[PDB]
Amino acid sequence: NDALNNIINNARDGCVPLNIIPLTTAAKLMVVIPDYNTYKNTCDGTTFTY
Amino acid sequence: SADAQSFLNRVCGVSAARLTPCGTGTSTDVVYRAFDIYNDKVAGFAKFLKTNCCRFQEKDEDDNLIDSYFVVKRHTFSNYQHEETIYNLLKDCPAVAKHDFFKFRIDGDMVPHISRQRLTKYTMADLVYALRHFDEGNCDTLKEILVTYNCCDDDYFNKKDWYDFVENPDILRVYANLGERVRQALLKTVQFCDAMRNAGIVGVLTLDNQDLNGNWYDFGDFIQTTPGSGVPVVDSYYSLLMPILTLTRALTAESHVDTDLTKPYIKWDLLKYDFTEERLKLFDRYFKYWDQTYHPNCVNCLDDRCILHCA
Amino acid sequence: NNELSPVALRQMSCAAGTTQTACTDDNALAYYNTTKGGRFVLALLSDLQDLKWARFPKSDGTGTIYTELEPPCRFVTDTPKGPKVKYLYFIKGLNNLNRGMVLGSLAATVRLQ
RNA sequence: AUUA
Ligand SMILES: Nc1nc2c(ncn2[C@@H]2O[C@H](COP(=O)(O)OP(=O)(O)NP(=O)(O)O)[C@@H](O)[C@H]2O)c(=O)[nH]1
Ligand SMILES: [Mg+2]
Ligand SMILES: [Zn+2]
Secondary structure: HHHHHHHHHHOOOOOOOOHHHHHOOOOOOOOOOOOHHHHHHHOOOOOOOO | OOOHHHHHHHHHOOOOOEEEEEOOOOOOOOEEHHHEEOOOEEEEEEEEEEEEOOOEEEOOOOOOOOOOOOOOEEOOHHHHHHHHHHHHOOOOOOOEOOEEEEEEEEEOOEEEEEEEEEEOEEEHHHHHHHHHHHOOOOOHEEEEEEEEHOOOOOHHOOOHHHHHOOOOOOOOHHHHOOHHHHHHHHHHHHHHHHHHHHHEEEEEHHHHHHEEEOOEEOOOOOOEOOOOOOOOOHHHHHHHOHHHHHHOOOHHHEEEEOOOOOOEEEOOOOOOOOOOOHHHHHHHHOOOOOOOOOOOHHHHOOOOOHHHHHH | EOOOOOOOOOOOOOOOOOOOOOOOOOEEEEEEOOOOEOOOEEEEEEOOOOOOOEEEEOOOOOEEEEEEOOOOOEEEOOOOOOOOOOOOOOEEOHHHHHHHHHEEEEEEHHHOO
């Protein structure tokens, strides 16, 4: 209830799209990888950016 | 003797005019093309047979043919004066092809010709007809159009199911290469409508009077009115062209910074959801003379027909 | 060939004003069309210089609509009379094709300047 | 367009 409040107050009338709430306030991320070629382009190493 | 080699250098203008006849002498050329007709006894959108035209392809420095044609036609004397007057009124628009009126004798009599310069081989109606009446048994026009504009190469069609949408979904990427041409044609159409309104000319716009570069011609069915009170009729044009606007994705350039295909994308904030003004700006930019009220939000519509129209 | 209404249309008669009930007797060459479902006028011409209103009578008589007009345009005509000036109007909401129809017919059947 |  702090990140959600922080992004709600920035809205000009209190309404925000639902598709950007997990994108900016979620704490955990889950990735499903088909094969190794896709793996080495998305989550290579120990830290990645998304 | 003379004639063919004198008509050639009379059609040959004053700019560079490296011309070559399209297998003719002084006679006309016959082709099979698509038109949009309404003349009180016939109507429809079909493929008729053109009869009165002589075409000269243009060359360049290394003597290899290019996509530029000089189309000269002969007709009566009254249409000559009418078209000359309308063109003189409309000649300053940058979206109007360059006409050239001269007189030449084929016999003891003298007949008038009208010559248009630097057109393409196919018009917009040909593309619309090819895409809206698809038949894989004979699609030569579509293949020619695709290969003459660097959408693909001639060996792309050696594949089978190259046209299918479920198999080979790469045909979408192949088709999406004409969107910029379509968008430039739309902009030139808006320019032409503005010029017609300012000059005081009344006429109906069809797809077969515009080539694939956007230029306009054929002012044979127009009339004259007081300046500032012109009115173009653009119902059939937009209505028939509409299904092609999404197949080729003509509005892709509107997601870039300066409507330029070489700059990065626009970065909207994630909290914006209205976009009610961008829709109006797009409508005013591409559909200015479509005369029917447009509601960005379908909650203000009057009935189900208006809902369909705005959706 | 895409022509703008070969078979033409017929007629022009009746009235006009500037503030609702200002239409007294007849101040309009209210032009054209008697459609197949009933009389539906298209174009309005005014020997006067400023009008915003009109009242065309039809069928029942009790049903005669107080039409809202639009800002006018002006031109001079090549009539045998000589100097003759009106101020052109169209009924509001008239789509482009109808204005093209009436303008083409007026210009190509009768002489104007 | 087959009205040239
Ligand atoms: N762009 C282009 N069109 C051609 C060519 N050769 C034939 N055409 C066809 O022939 C027509 C020639 O132009 P024009 O006759 O002025 O146009 P139109 O629509 O037939 N009207 P009109 O018969 O009143 O002159 C075009 O409409 C087009 O469909 C060509 O080399 N380039
Ligand atoms: Mg023609
Ligand atoms: Zn609506």
